[PDB]
PDB file of C-alpha atoms and ligand atoms in Angstrom:
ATOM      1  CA  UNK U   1      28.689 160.489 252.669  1.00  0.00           C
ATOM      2  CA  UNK U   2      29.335 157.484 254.890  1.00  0.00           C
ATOM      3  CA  UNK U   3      26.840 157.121 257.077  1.00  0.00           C
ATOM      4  CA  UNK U   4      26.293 155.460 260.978  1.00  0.00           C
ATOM      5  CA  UNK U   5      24.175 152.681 261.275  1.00  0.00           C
ATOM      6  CA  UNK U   6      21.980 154.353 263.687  1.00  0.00           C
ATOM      7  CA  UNK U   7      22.516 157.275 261.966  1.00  0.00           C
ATOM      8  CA  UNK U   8      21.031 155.766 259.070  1.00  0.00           C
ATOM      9  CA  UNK U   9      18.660 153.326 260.396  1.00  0.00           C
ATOM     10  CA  UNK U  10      17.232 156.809 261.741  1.00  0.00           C
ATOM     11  CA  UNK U  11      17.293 158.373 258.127  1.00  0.00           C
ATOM     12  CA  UNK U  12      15.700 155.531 256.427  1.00  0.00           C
ATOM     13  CA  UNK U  13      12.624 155.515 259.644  1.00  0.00           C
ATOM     14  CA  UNK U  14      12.322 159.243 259.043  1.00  0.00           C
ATOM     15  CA  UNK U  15      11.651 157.931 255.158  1.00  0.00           C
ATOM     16  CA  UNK U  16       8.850 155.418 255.770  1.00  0.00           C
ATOM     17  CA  UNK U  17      11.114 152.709 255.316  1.00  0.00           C
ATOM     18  CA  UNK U  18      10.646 151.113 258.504  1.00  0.00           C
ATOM     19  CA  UNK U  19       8.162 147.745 258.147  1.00  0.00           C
ATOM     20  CA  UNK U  20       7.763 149.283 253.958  1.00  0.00           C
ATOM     21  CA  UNK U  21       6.090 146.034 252.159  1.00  0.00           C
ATOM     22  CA  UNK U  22       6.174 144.559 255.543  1.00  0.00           C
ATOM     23  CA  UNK U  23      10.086 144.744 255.948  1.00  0.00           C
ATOM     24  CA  UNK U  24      11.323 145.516 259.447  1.00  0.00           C
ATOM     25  CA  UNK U  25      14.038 148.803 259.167  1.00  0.00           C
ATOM     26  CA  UNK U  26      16.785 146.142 260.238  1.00  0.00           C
ATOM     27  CA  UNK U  27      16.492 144.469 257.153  1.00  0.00           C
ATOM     28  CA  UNK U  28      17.342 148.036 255.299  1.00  0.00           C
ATOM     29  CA  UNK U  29      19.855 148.531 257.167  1.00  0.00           C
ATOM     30  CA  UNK U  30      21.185 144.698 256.857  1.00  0.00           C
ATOM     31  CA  UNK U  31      21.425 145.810 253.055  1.00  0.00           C
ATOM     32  CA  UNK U  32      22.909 148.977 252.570  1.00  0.00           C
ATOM     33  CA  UNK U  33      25.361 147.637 255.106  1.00  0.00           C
ATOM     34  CA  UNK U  34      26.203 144.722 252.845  1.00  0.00           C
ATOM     35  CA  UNK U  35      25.195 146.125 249.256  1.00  0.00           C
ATOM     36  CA  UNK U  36      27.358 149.511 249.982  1.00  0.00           C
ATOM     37  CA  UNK U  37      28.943 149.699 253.624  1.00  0.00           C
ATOM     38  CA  UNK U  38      26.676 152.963 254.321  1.00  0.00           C
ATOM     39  CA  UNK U  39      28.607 154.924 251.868  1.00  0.00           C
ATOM     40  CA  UNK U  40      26.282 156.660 249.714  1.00  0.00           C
ATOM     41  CA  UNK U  41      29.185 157.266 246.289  1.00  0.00           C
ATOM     42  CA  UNK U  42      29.494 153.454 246.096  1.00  0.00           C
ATOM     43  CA  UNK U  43      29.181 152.064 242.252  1.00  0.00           C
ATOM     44  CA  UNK U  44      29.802 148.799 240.721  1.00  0.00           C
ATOM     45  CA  UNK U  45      30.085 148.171 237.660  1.00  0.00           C
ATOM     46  CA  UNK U  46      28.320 144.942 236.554  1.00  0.00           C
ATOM     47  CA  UNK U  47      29.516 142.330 233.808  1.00  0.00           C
ATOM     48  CA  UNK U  48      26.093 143.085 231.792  1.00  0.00           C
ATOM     49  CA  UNK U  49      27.719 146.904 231.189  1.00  0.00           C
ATOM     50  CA  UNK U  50      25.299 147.851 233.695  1.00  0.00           C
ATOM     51  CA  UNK U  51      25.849 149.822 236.842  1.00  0.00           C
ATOM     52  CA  UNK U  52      24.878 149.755 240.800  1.00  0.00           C
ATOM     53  CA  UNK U  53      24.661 153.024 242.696  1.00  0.00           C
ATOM     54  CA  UNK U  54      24.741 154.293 246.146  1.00  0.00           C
ATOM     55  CA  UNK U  55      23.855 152.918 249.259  1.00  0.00           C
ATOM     56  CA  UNK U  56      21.338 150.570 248.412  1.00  0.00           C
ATOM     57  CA  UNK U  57      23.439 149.504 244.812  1.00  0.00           C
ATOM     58  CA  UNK U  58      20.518 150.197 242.885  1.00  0.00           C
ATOM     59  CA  UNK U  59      21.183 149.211 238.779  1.00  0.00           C
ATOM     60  CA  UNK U  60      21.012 151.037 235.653  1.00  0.00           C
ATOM     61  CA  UNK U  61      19.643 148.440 233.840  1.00  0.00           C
ATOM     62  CA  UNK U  62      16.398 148.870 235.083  1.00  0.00           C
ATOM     63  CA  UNK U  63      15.867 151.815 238.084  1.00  0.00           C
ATOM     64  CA  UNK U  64      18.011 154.627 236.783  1.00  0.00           C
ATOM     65  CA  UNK U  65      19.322 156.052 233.583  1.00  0.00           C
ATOM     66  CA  UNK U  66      23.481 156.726 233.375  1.00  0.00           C
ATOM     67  CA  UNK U  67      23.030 156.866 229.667  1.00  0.00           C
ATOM     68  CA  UNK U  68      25.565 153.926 229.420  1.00  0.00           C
ATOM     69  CA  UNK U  69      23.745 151.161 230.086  1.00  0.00           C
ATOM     70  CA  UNK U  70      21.787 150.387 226.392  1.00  0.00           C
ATOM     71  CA  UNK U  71      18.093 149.521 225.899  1.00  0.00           C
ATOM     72  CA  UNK U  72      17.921 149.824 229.657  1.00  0.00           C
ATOM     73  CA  UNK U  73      14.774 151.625 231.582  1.00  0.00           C
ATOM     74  CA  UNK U  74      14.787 154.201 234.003  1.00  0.00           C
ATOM     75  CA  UNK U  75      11.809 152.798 236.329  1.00  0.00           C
ATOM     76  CA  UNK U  76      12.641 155.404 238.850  1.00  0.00           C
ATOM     77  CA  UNK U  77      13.167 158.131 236.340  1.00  0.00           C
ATOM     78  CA  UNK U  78      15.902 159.264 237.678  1.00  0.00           C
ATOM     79  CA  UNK U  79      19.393 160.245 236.894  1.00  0.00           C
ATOM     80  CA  UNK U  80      21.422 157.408 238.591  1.00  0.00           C
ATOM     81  CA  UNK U  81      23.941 160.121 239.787  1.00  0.00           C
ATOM     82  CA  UNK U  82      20.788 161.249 241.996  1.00  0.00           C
ATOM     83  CA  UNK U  83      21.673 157.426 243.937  1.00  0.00           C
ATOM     84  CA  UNK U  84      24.876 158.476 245.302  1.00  0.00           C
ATOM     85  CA  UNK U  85      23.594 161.693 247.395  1.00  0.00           C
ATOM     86  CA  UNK U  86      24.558 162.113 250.590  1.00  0.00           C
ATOM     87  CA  UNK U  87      20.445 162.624 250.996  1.00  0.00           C
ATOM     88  CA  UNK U  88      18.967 159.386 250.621  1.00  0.00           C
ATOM     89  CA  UNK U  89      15.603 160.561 249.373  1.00  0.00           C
ATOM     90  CA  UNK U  90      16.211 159.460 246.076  1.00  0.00           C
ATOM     91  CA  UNK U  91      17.313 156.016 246.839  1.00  0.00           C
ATOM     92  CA  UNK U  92      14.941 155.419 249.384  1.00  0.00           C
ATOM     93  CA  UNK U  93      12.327 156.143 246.933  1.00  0.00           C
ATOM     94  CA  UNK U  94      13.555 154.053 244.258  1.00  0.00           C
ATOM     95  CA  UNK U  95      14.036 150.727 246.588  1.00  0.00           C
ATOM     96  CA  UNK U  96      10.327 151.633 247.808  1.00  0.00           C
ATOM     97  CA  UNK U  97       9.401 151.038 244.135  1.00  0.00           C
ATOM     98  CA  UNK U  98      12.101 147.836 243.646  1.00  0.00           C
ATOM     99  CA  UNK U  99      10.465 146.294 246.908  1.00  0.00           C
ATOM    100  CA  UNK U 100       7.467 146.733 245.557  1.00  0.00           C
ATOM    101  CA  UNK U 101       8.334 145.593 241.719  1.00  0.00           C
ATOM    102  CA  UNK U 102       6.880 141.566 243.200  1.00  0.00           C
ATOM    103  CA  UNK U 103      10.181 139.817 244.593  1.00  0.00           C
ATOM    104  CA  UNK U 104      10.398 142.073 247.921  1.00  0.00           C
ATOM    105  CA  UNK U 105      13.978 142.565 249.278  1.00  0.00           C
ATOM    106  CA  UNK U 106      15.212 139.317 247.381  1.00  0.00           C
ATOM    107  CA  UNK U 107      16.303 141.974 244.526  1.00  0.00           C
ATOM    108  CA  UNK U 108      18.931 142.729 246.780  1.00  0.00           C
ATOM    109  CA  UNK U 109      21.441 139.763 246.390  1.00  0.00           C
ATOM    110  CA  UNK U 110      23.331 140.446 249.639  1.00  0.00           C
ATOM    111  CA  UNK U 111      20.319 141.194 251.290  1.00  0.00           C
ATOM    112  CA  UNK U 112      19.057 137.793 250.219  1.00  0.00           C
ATOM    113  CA  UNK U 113      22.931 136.140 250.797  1.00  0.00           C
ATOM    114  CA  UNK U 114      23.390 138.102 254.105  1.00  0.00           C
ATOM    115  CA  UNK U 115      20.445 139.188 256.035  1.00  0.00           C
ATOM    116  CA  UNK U 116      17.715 137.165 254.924  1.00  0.00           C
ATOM    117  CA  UNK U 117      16.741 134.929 257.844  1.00  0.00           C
ATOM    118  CA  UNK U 118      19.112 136.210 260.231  1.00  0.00           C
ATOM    119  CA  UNK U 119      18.235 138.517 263.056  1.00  0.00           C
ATOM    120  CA  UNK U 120      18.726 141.851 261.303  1.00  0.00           C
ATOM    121  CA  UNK U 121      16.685 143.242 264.465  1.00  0.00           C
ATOM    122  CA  UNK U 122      20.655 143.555 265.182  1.00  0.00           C
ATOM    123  CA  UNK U 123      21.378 146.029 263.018  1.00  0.00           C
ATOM    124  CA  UNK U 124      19.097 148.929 264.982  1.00  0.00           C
ATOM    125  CA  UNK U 125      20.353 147.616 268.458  1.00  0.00           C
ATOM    126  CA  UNK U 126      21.056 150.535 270.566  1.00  0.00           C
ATOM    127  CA  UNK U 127      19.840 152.766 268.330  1.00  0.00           C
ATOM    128  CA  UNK U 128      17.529 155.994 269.205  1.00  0.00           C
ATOM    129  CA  UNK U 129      14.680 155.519 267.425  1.00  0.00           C
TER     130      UNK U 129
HETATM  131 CL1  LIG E   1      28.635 148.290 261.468  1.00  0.00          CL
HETATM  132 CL1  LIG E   2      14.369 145.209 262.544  1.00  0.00          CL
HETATM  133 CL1  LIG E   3      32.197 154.669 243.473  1.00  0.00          CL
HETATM  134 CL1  LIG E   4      21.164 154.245 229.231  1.00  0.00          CL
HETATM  135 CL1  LIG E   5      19.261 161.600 254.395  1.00  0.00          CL
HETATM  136 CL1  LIG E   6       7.669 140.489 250.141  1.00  0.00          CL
HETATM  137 NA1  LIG E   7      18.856 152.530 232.788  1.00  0.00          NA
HETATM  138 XE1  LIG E   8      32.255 151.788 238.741  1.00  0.00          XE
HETATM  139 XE1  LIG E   9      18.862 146.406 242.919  1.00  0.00          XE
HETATM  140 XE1  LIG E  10      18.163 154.344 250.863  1.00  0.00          XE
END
């Protein structure tokens, strides 16, 4: 599924994702915008073998298991084919425990590359929240 940005920005508030580890729900948004273009079936194969999955791009190597990504760990125990959903339960759960993990959003290189420090208070503009 391709989601809306409001559209999203709503599903991810409904989550608890809004101000999670202090991080505003423009700064979500900001991410999957950047890390996947709101499309929930996006994968990316890294150079390491591993893999990045759905809307937030969330890797095999250490959140999800694809069973092709060796000695990895599945942190989120959790099929990484559960990532690419068109309900973002899943992957909103599993960035709640990467935000957490002790580097906050920074995991998230576009998020660091393309949101951090800007006013991602954009990306909900207009929005009913
Ligand atoms: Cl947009
Ligand atoms: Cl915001
Ligand atoms: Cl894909
Ligand atoms: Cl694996
Ligand atoms: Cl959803
Ligand atoms: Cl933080
Ligand atoms: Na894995
Ligand atoms: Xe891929
Ligand atoms: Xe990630
Ligand atoms: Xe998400």
């Amino acid at each position: 599924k391709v989601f809306g940005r409001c559209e999203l920005a709503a599903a991810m508030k409904r989550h608890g994702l809004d101000n999670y580890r202090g991080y505003s729900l423009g700064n979500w948004v900001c991410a999957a915008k950047f890390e996947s273009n709101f499309n929930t079936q996006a994968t990316n194969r890294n150079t390491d073998g591993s893999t990045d999955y759905g809307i937030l791009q969330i890797n095999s190597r250490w959140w999800c298991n694809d069973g092709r990504t060796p000695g990895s760990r599945n942190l989120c125990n959790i099929p990484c084919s559960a990532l690419l959903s068109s309900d973002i339960t899943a992957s909103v759960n599993c960035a709640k425990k990467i935000v957490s993990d002790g580097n906050g959003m920074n995991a998230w290189v576009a998020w660091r590359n393309r949101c951090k420090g800007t006013d991602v208070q954009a990306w909900i503009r207009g929005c009913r929240l």
